[PDB]
Design an enzyme around this catalytic site. Structure first.
Site, short mmCIF file in Angstrom:
data_model
loop_
_atom_site.label_atom_id
_atom_site.label_comp_id
_atom_site.label_asym_id
_atom_site.label_seq_id
_atom_site.Cartn_x
_atom_site.Cartn_y
_atom_site.Cartn_z
CB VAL A 92 0.95 1.10 9.68
CG1 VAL A 92 1.87 1.54 8.54
CG2 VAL A 92 1.61 0.05 10.50
CB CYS A 93 0.82 6.84 9.26
SG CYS A 93 -0.04 8.24 8.56
CG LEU A 94 1.58 2.51 3.58
CD1 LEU A 94 2.88 3.24 3.34
CD2 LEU A 94 1.83 1.00 3.71
#
Lengths: 158, 910
Positions: A92-94
């Site tokens: 996840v790119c957060l």
């Protein structure tokens, strides 16, 4: 060191047990020793009610490095999901999960997961991790929503 | 390139709509340069134009935020107000525009506001609020004012600032909260406020709640939030607001407010009961979180205020209601799990009190805990067999984790209730057996299982009573069958002190042993009892050995459990007279020595290998637990089996799997026999040398090392081992040359063996067949291996090697001849080529050289440090001379040498 992390993860576990959003699940895994592993958690995030994600239960793994909580943990959906900020590997790119951006040692496991659940319904367009999903979300929203609803049905509980 | 609205806008199109990843990444990186450029202060405002689509507009808004948040020094103080104004205008513009651009411009304004305080902007909140009350409709302006007030705190949290700077900002920020809350209260108490405004207000409130504002200032908003729990649309937000407000670190600073909240929590009882009635799980879950948050986090503080004890007690019962909510976890509800940690806390707090507080509170909660016990056992109960079928794999898992949590809870309830809890159990089980779903009986036993290991042995007269009831249970289910076995295993240690009861629990275990569906549980319990009661189980040894042999013959157990059963028997037999061990050992092995033989004369097959291996496994597992020492039946059995063993080696000397199973049989034998194994040494060494030659394995070196250690003092038996030592080394050295870094484990073991030889049989290095120069070469190269285990082992070899300087000629020649090589490798490691974790290890090598090879050390260090940039480029000539002077001290405690290396290795790395 490693001990510092393990103690903080024991705390996160205790807080998550007593206080966590309905529908979510966060649980440490067991080592081959049979001993409990705080460095690897098996979680599942439900789709926000009222969105196309509603009804689906999306599993993800949370992995901790020995420098926790100084460095944010790596979150990865298993299996990878159709989504703009989710790399095909499942990662996840957060921004809060980035040590050099927003991750603060104080962030809890409840916060991370809620942050990911929010990111599901609302893709951050500042960073593309999946070419197609990220393109379809900008280029043709109707198709995007159609696929997301199919995904939500695919991960419906049985 | 050049950053213009035209070019920046073309790049956005490419990133947003060009399907190809390569391009996108290009566009992204180009945009990352454009967002920080000076041109951003000019093209960001242009990207906000109505013609640019929302997404493109966002980049402009986002870039503005970067320039203010990042390049605040690009703005002059005279332009603060003007810039201020420009952003308020833009925010009003987008209160009716795109929502994403609105938030983004709000974050920008909040960044500028913070940068401004405390002095540059006296009343950031007052100004913001006043301007929005003043083009847009009321709802759009209000939601926009809230968006801004909500993001303000969130930006502070991410603002990377200086302790000094940050304090000033936080301080002014706490003052600004005096204007925020009032506004929020207004909006909620105004019946004209729409549901959407209410939601943002709660969200805004939670944002400032993270800033840790005093719980007292929140009373007004917390009370309003409680009231909003009535509205379905607002439930989610207020549950989160209430919980966060109560869960603040310093919320414990305001105990008074907390008391005032209890009634607000109790007021929810009706809503909670209704949700249970309707089956709405999301709701009971939320109300429970609120109740648990108050009682769990301030249990002792609320208990300290005795005058309100009644209010707290009602709260405790409300939690009890959630712990016992109707239905099965987690199919019918997921609330009960939130309350378990609470029962730990409450109990812990009461035990903490002393005198009257402890005693009076005990009279108040002892009955509450008995009620809990009743509730926990009902919840630990399984659903009907039919209903369970419909459960997914996951739902079943959540209930297993849930039962484990209840076991811990019961273990603490035990410490609160003492032995009266045990009597309580006896009555419940006794009643059910005589006064009948397996589920109900299984849960009651589960209760006993979760408390069984924790039971003191002092108030155990009730325990015998319970053991008696087990043999009266109708074992109708596999689940109940395991519980019964696990309970008996849990009482293993208690039985070792009360041997009469063995008679009662053993028949059950031995009977379960014949049912494959109960293989794992029955064999583990038999192993536990066999380990704990071996000395009192000698009389029953005969029956146990019989039932085990029968069960094996019928293929009732999978290989892994066959090995456990053998370990179990090892214990059992270790407690019988030698004559008896012998009669049973043959009973056990005779029937397999035959199968092995048919197998040895058989032609090797994949299925043939699995079988041969499993049988060998039984033996090595048998000899692990069978230590007669702490005749020699094992020795005779060995000599007799050795003849067959060799037979197997002939056709399988090339099987990795088999060559090690055989090794294991001797490893476990030598650890049990030790010195008494002396007869077998000669035969074993011959067999090991052939094994090692054909297929080298660490395990063989390890057994060789075990031999050297064990027979190093008696020269009578040692000759054969010396032969083995030399052979193994020859083979290992030659295999090392082909690909040194291919067998970390063998290199590790080899280093350990060598060190063991140096420690117990030094002269061995005098052997003419030994290549001392090659060994030293191997150890020096091993220090540079990636694996810590392999390096530690190499360091350990040199640690032992050096003290033998001047004691053994060969070791003296090698250290004098190639020692510079060793030292250089050591400085390379300290310079940075080795994990910091291994520094102590390398320091040991230095200490050893200082004490034993000083004259050489002194000479070598000066030559090795002369070159600039070695061991590190960061080291100054002065630094190098400081280290060498410190290490060349003739007197030093090894404790100091590690220090010098620590300090030095840091400089080399930075």
């Amino acid at each position: 060191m490693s001990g510092i992390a393990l103690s903080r993860l024991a705390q996160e576990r205790k807080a998550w047990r007593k206080d966590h959003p309905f529908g979510f699940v966060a649980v440490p895994t067991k080592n081959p020793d049979g001993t409990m592993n705080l460095m690897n958690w098996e979680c599942a995030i439900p789709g926000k009610k009222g969105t196309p994600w509603e009804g689906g239960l999306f599993k993800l793994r949370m992995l901790f490095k020995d420098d926790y909580p100084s460095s944010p943990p790596k979150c990865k959906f298993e299996p990878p999901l159709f989504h703009p900020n989710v790399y095909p590997s499942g990662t996840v790119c957060l921004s809060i999960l980035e040590e050099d951006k927003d991750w603060r040692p104080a962030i809890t496991i409840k916060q991370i997961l809620l942050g990911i659940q929010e990111l599901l319904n609302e893709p951050n367009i500042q960073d593309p991790a999946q070419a197609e999903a990220y393109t379809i979300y900008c280029q043709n929203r109707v198709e995007y929503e159609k696929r997301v609803r199919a995904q939500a049905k695919k991960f419906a509980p049985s | 390139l050049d950053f213009t609205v035209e070019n920046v806008e073309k790049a956005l199109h490419q990133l947003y709509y060009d399907p190809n990843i390569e391009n996108k990444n290009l566009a992204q990186k180009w945009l990352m340069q454009a967002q920080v450029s000076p041109q951003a202060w000019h093209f960001s405002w242009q990207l906000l134009q109505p013609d640019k689509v929302p997404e493109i507009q966002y980049f402009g808004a986002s870039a503005l935020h970067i320039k203010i948040s990042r390049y605040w020094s690009d703005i002059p103080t005279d332009q603060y107000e003007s810039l201020k104004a420009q952003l308020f205008t833009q925010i009003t513009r987008f209160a009716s525009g795109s929502k994403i651009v609105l938030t983004r411009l709000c974050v920008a304004l909040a960044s500028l506001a913070l940068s401004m305080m405390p002095d540059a902007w006296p009343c950031a909140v007052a100004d913001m609020v006043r301007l929005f009350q003043a083009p847009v409709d009321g709802q759009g302006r209000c939601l926009a004012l809230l968006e801004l007030l909500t993001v303000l705190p969130e930006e502070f949290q991410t603002s990377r600032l200086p302790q000094y700077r940050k304090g000033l900002v936080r301080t002014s920020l706490a003052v600004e909260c005096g204007a925020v809350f009032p506004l929020l209260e207004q909006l909620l108490q105004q019946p004209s406020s729409p549901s959407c405004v209410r939601q943002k207000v709660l969200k805004c409130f939670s944002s400032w709640v993270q800033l840790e504002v005093p719980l007292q200032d929140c009373e007004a908003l917390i009370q309003a939030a409680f009231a909003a729990l009535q509205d379905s649309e607002l439930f989610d937000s207020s549950v989160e607001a209430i919980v966060n407000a109560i869960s603040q670190p310093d919320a414990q600073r305001y105990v008074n407010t907390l008391l005032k909240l209890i009634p607000l929590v109790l007021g929810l009882q009706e809503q909670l009961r209704q949700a249970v009635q309707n089956g709405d799980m999301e709701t009971s879950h939320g109300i429970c979180r609120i109740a648990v948050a108050l009682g769990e986090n301030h249990s002792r503080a609320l208990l300290d205020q005795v005058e309100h004890w009644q209010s707290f007690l009602a709260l405790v019962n409300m939690i009890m209601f959630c712990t016992g909510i109707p239905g099965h976890y987690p199919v019918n509800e997921t609330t009960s799990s939130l309350t378990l940690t609470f029962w730990y806390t409450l109990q812990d707090d009461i035990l903490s009190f002393e005198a009257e507080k402890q005693a009076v509170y005990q009279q108040v909660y002892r009955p509450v805990y008995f009620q809990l016990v009743d509730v926990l056992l009902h919840k630990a109960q399984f659903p009907s067999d039919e209903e369970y079928g419909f459960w997914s794999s996951d739902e079943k898992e959540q209930f297993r984790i849930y039962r484990v949590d209840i076991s811990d809870t019961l273990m603490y309830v035990y410490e609160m209730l003492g032995a009266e809890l045990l009597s309580n159990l006896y009555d419940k089980l006794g009643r059910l057996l005589t006064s009948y779903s397996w589920q109900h009986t299984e849960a009651l036993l589960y209760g006993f299982q979760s408390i069984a290991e924790t039971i003191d042995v002092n108030y155990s007269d009730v325990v015998p009573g319970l053991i008696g009831l087990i043999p009266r249970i109708s074992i109708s289910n596999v689940q109940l069958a395991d519980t019964v076995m696990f309970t008996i295993g849990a009482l293993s240690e208690w039985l070792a002190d009360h041997p009469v009861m063995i008679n009662s629990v053993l028949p059950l275990v031995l009977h379960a042993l014949g049912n494959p569906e109960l293989s794992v549980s029955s064999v583990s319990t038999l192993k536990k009892i066999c380990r704990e009661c071996k000395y009192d189980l000698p009389p029953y040894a005969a029956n146990i050995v019989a039932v085990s042999q029968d069960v094996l013959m019928k293929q009732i157990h999978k290989t892994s459990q066959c090995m456990w059963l053998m370990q179990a028997l090892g214990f059992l037999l270790s407690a019988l007279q030698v004559e008896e061990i012998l009669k049973n050992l043959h009973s056990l092995i005779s029937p397999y020595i035959q199968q092995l033989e048919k197998l040895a004369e058989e032609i090797p097959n994949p299925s043939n290998k699995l079988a041969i291996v499993h049988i060998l496994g039984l033996l090595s597992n048998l000899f692990t637990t069978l230590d007669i020492s702490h005749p020699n039946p094992v020795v005779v059995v060995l000599q007799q089996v050795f003849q067959l063993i060799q037979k197997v080696l002939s056709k399988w000397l090339n099987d990795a799997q088999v060559v090690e199973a055989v090794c294991a049989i001797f490893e476990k034998s030598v650890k049990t026999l030790l010195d008494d194994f002396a007869p077998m040494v000669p035969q074993l060494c011959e067999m090991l040398g052939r094994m090692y030659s054909t297929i080298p394995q660490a395990s063989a070196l390890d057994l060789t090392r075990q031999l050297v250690h064990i027979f190093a003092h008696e020269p009578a038996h040692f000759p054969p081992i010396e032969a083995l030592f030399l052979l193994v080394t020859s083979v290992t050295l030659t295999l090392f040359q082909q690909g040194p870094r291919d067998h970390p484990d063998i290199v590790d073991s080899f280093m350990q063996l060598l060190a063991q030889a140096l420690k117990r049989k030094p002269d061995l290095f005098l052997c003419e067949r030994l290549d001392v120069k090659a060994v030293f070469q191997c150890a020096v190269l091993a220090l540079k291996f990636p694996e810590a285990p392999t390096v530690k082992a190499s360091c350990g070899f040199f640690t032992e090697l050096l003290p033998r300087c001047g004691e053994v000629e060969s070791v003296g020649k090698v250290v004098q001849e190639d020692g510079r090589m060793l030292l250089i490798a050591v400085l390379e490691a300290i310079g940075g080529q080795a994990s910091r974790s291994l520094m102590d290890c390398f320091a040991d090598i230095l200490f050893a050289l200082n004490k034993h090879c000083f004259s050489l050390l002194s000479m070598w260090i000066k030559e090795a440090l002369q070159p600039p940039g070695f061991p590190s480029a960061r080291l100054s000539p002065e630094q190098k001379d400081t280290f060498s002077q410190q290490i060349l001290r003739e007197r030093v405690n090894k404790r100091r040498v590690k220090e010098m290396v620590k300090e030095f290795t840091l400089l080399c790395r930075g």
